[PDB]
């Protein structure tokens, strides 16, 4: 015996049909629009939405005054409103079924850095996150698939130690300025 944990998850599912042109076109459209690395990012977002929809379906079969349904539905709807997918007015258990993949692809730090004008394309956003130029609140965030919470969105900034933030121009600028 070891004091180690063996619990783990696969965070995506591979589709049933390998070569279906409608799926291929739709997935490449999502990748090119949100600047994702591969199909597995699409499949991961699709897996997360499928799990949320399964939970909502399971809660809708329960009685409208059932305690479990009320409590778990309130938690589920609160979590969906907190990250910025649902809105406060549309916070009902049957409106979870009106959720698309592009709602969840909009809350990514890549998409938010591009939307805030910090980058000049979506691929520029992915690079600039990977370069450690973007902080959220006070923490430097290195992941582009970081889901931005709605309260967290109001201050996404340029990472004081970055060249585009506080200062200290980088390796190339230091080398080129040390020419003459």
């Amino acid at each position: 015996p070891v004091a180690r944990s063996w619990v783990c998850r696969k965070t995506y599912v591979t589709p049933r049909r390998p070569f279906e042109k409608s799926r291929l076109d739709q997935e490449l459209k999502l990748i090119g629009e949100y600047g994702l690395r591969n199909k597995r990012e699409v499949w991961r977002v699709k897996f997360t939405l499928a799990k949320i929809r399964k939970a909502a379906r399971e809660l809708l079969t329960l009685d409208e005054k059932d305690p479990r349904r009320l409590f778990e539905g309130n938690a589920l709807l609160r979590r969906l409103v907190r990250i910025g997918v649902l809105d406060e007015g549309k916070m009902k258990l049957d409106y979870i079924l009106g959720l698309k993949i592009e709602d969840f692809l909009e809350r990514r730090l890549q998409t938010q850095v591009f939307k805030l004008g910090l980058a000049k394309s979506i691929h520029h956003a992915r690079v600039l996150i990977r370069q450690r130029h973007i902080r959220v609140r006070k923490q430097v965030v290195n992941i582009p698939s970081f889901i931005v919470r709605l309260d967290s969105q109001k201050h996404i900034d340029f990472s004081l130690r970055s060249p585009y933030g506080g200062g200290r121009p980088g390796r190339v600028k230091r080398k080129n300025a040390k020419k003459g």
């Binding site: 450690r132 430097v140 130690r161």
Partner: protein, 124 residues
């Protein structure tokens, strides 16, 4: 200059004769701050000599801001030598470990097991 010492959850252990605390270190440009001047800043903070205080477990967060470790301040150095683990005392040079390996003393133990009487003290 820019290095800051702040103290989170604080306890006075009267049973082990010490003050227990969590230290947050803010050092925005520099590396992880060495333990020695953490002990210096913590000595000026708490008005005690730095030879009775022990700090450990400092993990610098991603990005390069805070560093959180655990610290403790003893009432006296005698209580420190009575309560500290031996490795934290030896990091101050107040203790030394034996240089024999585990293998050497296992083999010596079984070789001594094979003999009887004060001939045990001869073999080794």
């Amino acid at each position: 200059d820019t290095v800051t010492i702040r103290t989170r959850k604080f306890m006075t252990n009267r049973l082990l004769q010490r003050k227990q605390m969590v230290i947050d270190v803010l050092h925005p440009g520099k590396a992880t701050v060495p333990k020695t001047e953490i002990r210096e800043k913590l000595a000026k903070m708490y008005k005690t000599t730095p030879d009775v205080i022990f700090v450990f477990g400092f993990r610098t967060h991603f990005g390069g801001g805070k560093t959180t470790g655990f610290g403790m301040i003893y009432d006296s150095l005698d209580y420190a030598k009575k309560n500290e683990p031996k490795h934290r005392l030896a990091r101050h040079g107040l203790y030394e470990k034996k240089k024999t390996s585990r293998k050497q003393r296992k083999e010596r133990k079984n070789r001594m097991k094979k003999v009887r009487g004060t001939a045990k003290a001869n073999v080794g």
